[model samples]
Target: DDTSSSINFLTRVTGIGPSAARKLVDEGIKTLEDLRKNEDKLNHHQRIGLKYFEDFEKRIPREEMLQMQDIVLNEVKKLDPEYIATVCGSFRRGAESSGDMDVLLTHPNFTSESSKQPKLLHRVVEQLQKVRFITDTLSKGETKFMGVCQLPSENEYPHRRIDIRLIPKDQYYCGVLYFTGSDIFNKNMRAHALEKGFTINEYTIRPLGVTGVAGEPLPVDSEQDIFDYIQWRYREPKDRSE
Candidate 1:
């Protein structure tokens, strides 16, 4: 009975019915902590369902997510081949599936001047709209786009709730950590930074109370730099759950 109640709560958060909920329960996931610990085992349907279970708990059909990725990638490619971009987040972490794709974009020549370049993010958004896969814009700004769309699926339905974010190249490494999150991992890293008397902002990790905040953001030329700075063992996105 207790297990059923727990399964009900899990399903309520994850958007699964009794059958799917029982499947998760059978697999040893009875709470958010359990789900987080066993993230890699989640199948596509369960992953999408869990997304609904989390804050939204509504399925973001796979085809829709893919359609959004294609449109966004096309626009981004046109913007700059030199600009490095990849989808991260729940998708990148290999969750059997994802509710939405999180795209990370960066240019090698990142600078305040580069950030001011005309219509960089804007251009991408414009092109995505033209594809019509992006059905409606939820929010569009310099660094983020949230929208809804329909994707063709073999399952006889369209996928929905696609999201994308554009970030500066200089902040790429930090963004990787932020988006490739286990939530707990990110929290532990932050705590470590504070223990060392520093603060880890999205852009940089800097020593606290430094006059004028004049220190350069710790050099994170590679993902390893982030791990070294926080004293965490290197963990590929795949290994994050375990």
Candidate 2:
């Protein structure tokens, strides 16, 4: 119970752990006020951690997450009947309170090069914006959009952080596994993957050839494939959180 406000809360943000949070507090940076002022002591991630500190600290209720999930899926369904989307991260882990919302989406025709094709990823972002669900864009690219979102004005929802990632149909499970992470769990899985002579990332799990050279990507058709390949016990997303 550090109880110094920002130091206590910093440990809860993504990418920051207890040890790192303690260092910041030890540097006389007990508040986001000190965090913003102590740039020389902070990395870009810790800086972002401080910048969005307020927004990230807010917990999203399960009910709101359900509504937002339906809103997104129903809209995308109208666009492409076969479109598939999942709310992952803490939401997928069934947390009562979540730092943010995450959705990993895939369509029959969407892929890594989707931006160059029909721009399905771009179109989805545009549509969400048109409906005023997405109020701010933190960043946008070919396959991912990070932003702030709020429910309809008729509801009492606060603006919560949201990420929409467009994955290729073939790579959907890998995307799901990565985004459903508890941060700590992902790192452990990656470390174990390395020990198993496999490289697992958000996109693919590939073999490490002789002489330790990375080989072609393996077929990861399901999230279970990753655990099986690494010889690890399979755990559902809800059990994977720290």
Candidate 2 residues 1-242, lDDT tens each?
64666666767654467888877777766755666677778665555555566666678889888888888887887777787888888888888877778888888676555535337777878888888888777667777887778889763566778888878977888889988888999999999999999988888899897888777777876899989999999989888875
Cα distance off (Å), candidate 2, residue 108: 3.2
Candidate 1 residue 27 Cα shift, in angstroms, is 46
Pairs in clash, predicted candidate 1: 13-53, 14-53, 52-56, 52-57, 52-58, 53-57, 61-159, 64-151
- Model 2 segments more than 4 A misplaced: 1-57, 112-115
TM-score of each: 0.62, 0.70
Model 1 C-alpha lDDT per residue in residues 1-242, reported as the tens digit of each score:
98778877876643356886788888878887787687677654455545434335455544445655676677678777876677777666666667666777776766534666536666665666675555565556676766555553445344356556666776778888787887877777788877776677677777676553534576677778877876778888877763
> Which candidate should be chosen as best, given TM-score against the real structure?
2
